[PDB]
């Protein structure tokens, strides 16, 4: 019993981390095979950042001006590329801890392990979800950027965020290993701002399931309602409309405890209009959405 | 920016988790050189759970009794003795993973990541902290039992916790490497009860500098208190006394913020008597006591 923010075992991404350095620019870069992958804006200088052309200053680089160190092992550079936003270093050595990977782009709403890193080395693992406004509620400090975030399926890793940079607001923001940013940003160093953001609905519920699984009971209700009818106090709480496929997405969770999705709904609709009168549901005081349906199946099995 | 329940890479760790399986019963043990450690009660039978005398058990097994997998790979017991609670099953295979490693008895409050083990085979990893009535609050289904916990120091991964059993609360309850338990609790199936358990208020107070460092002010008073007065209050919140060990090691952060650690101790003297008032602390509605003063340090750098 008890369910807590798991994150995924990060030893077969930790033997990927390493050290890239261009000039005066070190991050961190992800050494699969013969590739070393990393943001692309490791090549600017300050003055560069405020509005690059980076077409304009890779030309102007060589394979010599990319320090890259793997432990206190320094690889050699035999070639170089632009790929969106990520920079891809082909190196003379094929890394001998490649795990077997995939590159996935993931939806708002579903969850990865970040391994935050500073000049290549792991220091510590969390869980994330990709909010509905493509941010991310990150741990980042300077050096962190080149941090991915990643997903474990049979010893597949899917590797699915790059981290790139933090907002003003103290949100990050990334891309996928192919170096297509989540959401509308940019990599200058300008103030953009994300959208307003909203509460993942469907994890919500996950999360209630979650909760009667390991025995908490307290808020569910004799109740059921309509899906239109719940949607329309989700807009006014804020919340990202239900959609007949999460209905369908939460069914294994229904069939386990015995209560359908939509008599859920009626508790979640409940505790958004009268709140949870100083009670709280497996240990939170406040209603959470990082926890997929997956990942509440993962955790409360059987 | 940013402040997230944090665990350690987990990869040195991953590389010495060995299944053991002595009859019907498997769970999970730790293979550090030739030795492998795993909790002792894997050599009962459900009968022999209810009131067990190891002693007579163990003098009844073989080597060949006990079967150890690493990997696909089986390793041959050639030794094996009883440290407490512990079970040592000595191998003629020293680990080539094994990192730097250190057996460490940890004081309540103190945290540690904790890596969920099935069968051998890492899960998840999230982060613990010992509870004052020496319980943690983890997340363990059956076949978890042999999962351990660590900090890890300068790549000395310092293990500090074997997980036993989880009480009819849903707590859970295990030992130190050297088989000794945490708490009263004894390695047999019966319903042992923990002691009342109260919050860990320098942890607190680490966590109220957390949101400080973080920008957040706004539960910040222009009031300081003694610490008896302090610790007045304490009691009645059912709060763990904060000592002047405790006042000194919260110096670094008090010097980091300007914020004298009993101007802080007025701050949450106010949050106990007035709650918050719908407003949240670092995403919290509720005062987290699972981050030690180190923690904060470690993840809030700058
Ligand atoms: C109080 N908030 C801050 O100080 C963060 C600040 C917000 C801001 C941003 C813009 C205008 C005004 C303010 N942003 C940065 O300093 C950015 C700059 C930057 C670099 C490269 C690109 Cl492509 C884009 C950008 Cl915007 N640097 C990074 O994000 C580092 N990679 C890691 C890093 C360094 C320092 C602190 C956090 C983190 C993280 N994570
Ligand atoms: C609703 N709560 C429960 O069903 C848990 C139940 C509570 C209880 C305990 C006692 C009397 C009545 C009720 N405890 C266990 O079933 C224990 C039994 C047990 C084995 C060995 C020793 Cl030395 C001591 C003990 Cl007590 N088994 C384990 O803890 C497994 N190692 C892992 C495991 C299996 C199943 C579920 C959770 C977990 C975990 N973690």
Not at 20 to 32: H, I, S
Not at 55 to 72: C, M, P, T
Not at 112 to 139: D, E, H, W
Not at 267 to 287: D, P, V, W
């Amino acid at each position: 019993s008890g369910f807590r923010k798991m994150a995924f075992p990060s030893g077969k991404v930790e033997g990927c981390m390493v050290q890239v350095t261009c000039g005066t620019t070190t991050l961190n870069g992800l050494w699969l095979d013969d590739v070393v992958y990393c943001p692309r804006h490791v090549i600017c200088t300050s003055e560069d950042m405020l509005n690059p052309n980076y077409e304009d200053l890779l030309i102007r680089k060589s394979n010599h001006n990319f320090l890259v160190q793997a432990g206190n092992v320094q690889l050699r550079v035999i070639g170089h590329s632009m790929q969106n936003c990520v920079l891809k270093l082909k190196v003379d050595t094929a890394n001998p801890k490649t795990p077997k990977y995939k590159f996935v782009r993931i939806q708002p709403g579903q969850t990865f392990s970040v391994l935050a890193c500073y000049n290549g080395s792991p220091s510590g693992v969390y869980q994330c979800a990709m909010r509905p406004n493509f941010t991310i509620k990150g741990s980042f400090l300077n050096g962190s950027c080149g941090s991915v975030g990643f997903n474990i399926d049979y010893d597949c890793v899917s590797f699915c965020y790059m981290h790139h940079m933090e907002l003003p607001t103290g949100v990050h923001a990334g891309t996928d290993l192919e170096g297509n940013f989540y959401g509308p940003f940019v990599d200058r160093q300008t103030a953009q701002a994300a959208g307003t953001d909203t509460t993942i609905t469907v994890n919500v519920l996950a999360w209630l399931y979650a909760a009667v699984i390991n025995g908490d009971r307290w808020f569910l209700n004799r109740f059921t309602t309509t899906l239109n009818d719940f949607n329309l106090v989700a807009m006014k709480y804020n919340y990202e409309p239900l959609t007949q496929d999460h209905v369908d997405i939460l069914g294994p969770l229904s069939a386990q405890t015995g209560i359908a999705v939509l008599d859920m709904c009626a508790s979640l609709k409940e505790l958004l209009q009268n709140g949870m009168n100083g009670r709280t549901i497996l240990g939170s005081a406040l209603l959470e959405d990082e926890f997929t349906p997956f990942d509440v199946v993962r955790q409360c099995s059987g």
